[PDB]
Amino acid sequence: ILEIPVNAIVPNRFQPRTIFSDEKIKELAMTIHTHGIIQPIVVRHTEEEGQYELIAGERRWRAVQSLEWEKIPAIIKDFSDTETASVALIENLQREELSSIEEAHAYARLLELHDLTQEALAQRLGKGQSTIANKLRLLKLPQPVQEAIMEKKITERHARALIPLKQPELQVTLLTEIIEKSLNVKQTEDRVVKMLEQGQR
Amino acid sequence: EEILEIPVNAIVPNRFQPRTIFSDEKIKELAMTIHTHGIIQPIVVRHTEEEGQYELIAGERRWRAVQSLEWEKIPAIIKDFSDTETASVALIENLQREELSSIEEAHAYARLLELHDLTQEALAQRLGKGQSTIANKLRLLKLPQPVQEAIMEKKITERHARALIPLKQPELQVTLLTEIIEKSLNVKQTEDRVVKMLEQGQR
DNA sequence: TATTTCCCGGGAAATA
DNA sequence: TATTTCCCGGGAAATA
Structure with missing residues (x-):
């Protein structure tokens, strides 16, 4: 006992x-x-x-x-x-799969350390140069968003859809809305478009 | 070297x-x-x-x-x-972690079901998957060994092999397997190629 | 080893 | 290298 x-x-x-x-x-x-x-x-x-x-x-x-x-x-x-x-x-x-930001950090280091091209890295990992580029882009996103990726609260494409807003405050806003309303990426992409017409007014 | x-x-x-x-x-x-x-x-x-x-x-x-x-x-x-x-x-x-093939998972599911006398529902619960996902993997075990190898050797995708099942004749399946590779067919095409071969079974 | 249908995010081609 | 576009197989809901 x-x-x-x-x-x-x-x-x-x-x-x-x-x-x-x-x-x-x-x-x-x-x-x-x-x-x-x-x-x-x-x-x-x-x-x-x-x-x-x-x-x-x-x-x-x-x-x-x-x-x-x-x-x-x-x-x-x-x-x-x-x-x-x-x-x-x-x-x-149930093999523990690395998150986008984890991979992004891995790609970033490999490119810095061994002075590789994205093409070169993409070749080795059997991926497309654009796939490597679009992961590395996520590193510019706010830390709260990066955590949500790691904690698997949102998908890669979710985080990618936030990038256009460019304003960290606007992104962290939508991040919470994506989680609260359980929004898919198609919805998240539209929610962004509509917020870039509120930037016009 | x-x-x-x-x-x-x-x-x-x-x-x-x-x-x-x-x-x-x-x-x-x-x-x-x-x-x-x-x-x-x-x-x-x-x-x-x-x-x-x-x-x-x-x-x-x-x-x-x-x-x-x-x-x-x-x-x-x-x-x-x-x-x-x-x-x-x-x-x-x-x-670049080696991700398990359909047949590998199918064999894993089959053993887990034999060992613990579990339902597919029960296994699907544990693995956090849908009963149908478990069922449709186990189905692949009925396919001809040549097709099973093609899945393992990653020559075709799970959905490719699943699409062959309706052609219940092993000879017809191994035929299409080669055609999928030669013509680099996607699954949508493979599904149609099957439909058309089940009208040649009528004629 | 039950089977059919079909939605949607990964990920890469097209593009800048 | 970085960004936009969008096809398609995984995988699960529905199951004339």
């Missing part, structure tokens, strides 16, 4: 997220408030270190979330015969 | 490269390809600060395969690269 952070636990990832009745949870939380915690939750380790995935006791975990405890008693499971092999597969599938 | 045999014990991973994670099965799969035909693409290394010790530049995967095969020696190409060159070679490789 181990006490683990309530924030570290996530529901069973293969199953759909369960939705419990507030009354049934309150009814369970009142059973914990009276008699205490009686059965610890069962979890395992995720790909990340500080993070656990719930196997059993999702109901009890939710009860202690509402009771606002920082810690929850838990039983860790150390499975290998299948788990470790499958975790290797799922990780080999 | 020049190939030389060096001690497996003398080689260390690329400093600037992040600590790689390889599947024991994928390594064993490579080691068994070396054990059978007795041929390896030689690793690229350089000399360290110490003598008789080499630092790996490329081919960490192949080096690991020969470690498990328990050979004392590994064919290698020495390069006089500076800490900057070595670091940039690590970057360019970290950029």
Whole structure:
């Protein structure tokens, strides 16, 4: 038995997220408030270190979330015969892909250090000179926008669509609107066009 | 160029490269390809600060395969690269990461479904994908081996191979595969070329 | 391994 | 090199 952070636990990832009745949870939380915690939750380790995935006791975990405890008693499971092999597969599938700005910084360094042409770099990476150029352009964008690219909140084309505005204040404005209204790039491109007619008036 | 045999014990991973994670099965799969035909693409290394010790530049995967095969020696190409060159070679490789082919993913999905007795829905949930995306990959496993190789060798795209499935006859599919390559057909054309061949099945 | 339809961002050709 | 244009396969919603 181990006490683990309530924030570290996530529901069973293969199953759909369960939705419990507030009354049934309150009814369970009142059973914990009276008699205490009686059965610890069962979890395992995720790909990340500080993070656990719930196997059993999702109901009890939710009860202690509402009771606002920082810690929850838990039983860790150390499975290998299948788990470790499958975790290797799922990780080999969900390979961590570098963001536009990450690549842009990588391209910038490679061009500075080894005095390469964009053509030369594009050749090596099996890409078009224009693809390299349009990534490097993103480096001129405001740091808030660059973070949104990294945090994968927006796509490359989203950030590219902001470049024409040229004014950092106008860009960070739309960035928040893109996220809040979940705008696609086609919408984002139009939203820019319309703001460059408000620049005329 | 020049190939030389060096001690497996003398080689260390690329400093600037992040600590790689390889599947024991994928390594064993490579080691068994070396054990059978007795041929390896030689690793690229350089000399360290110490003598008789080499630092790996490329081919960490192949080096690991020969470690498990328990050979004392590994064919290698020495390069006089500076800490900057070595670091940039690590970057360019970290950029041009080998992305898994449709068939590779299909085989991965099939195993994951066999192992954990999961639904396609369940797997799709875990991988953050749509049930249909999982289904349509697994479908490719029914295609002729020539077509499956073309996917792997990246001669055609997933959607190309998917478009062949309706031509339920393996002979008709391998026919179009060659036509897709020869005429450099996109998927839209390949879909039409199939429709037209299912009116030649009527005639 | 169920299949069809089709929207949309990657990314490169065209262009400056 | 930097910028504009826009085609097309990934991949998921819909599934006469």
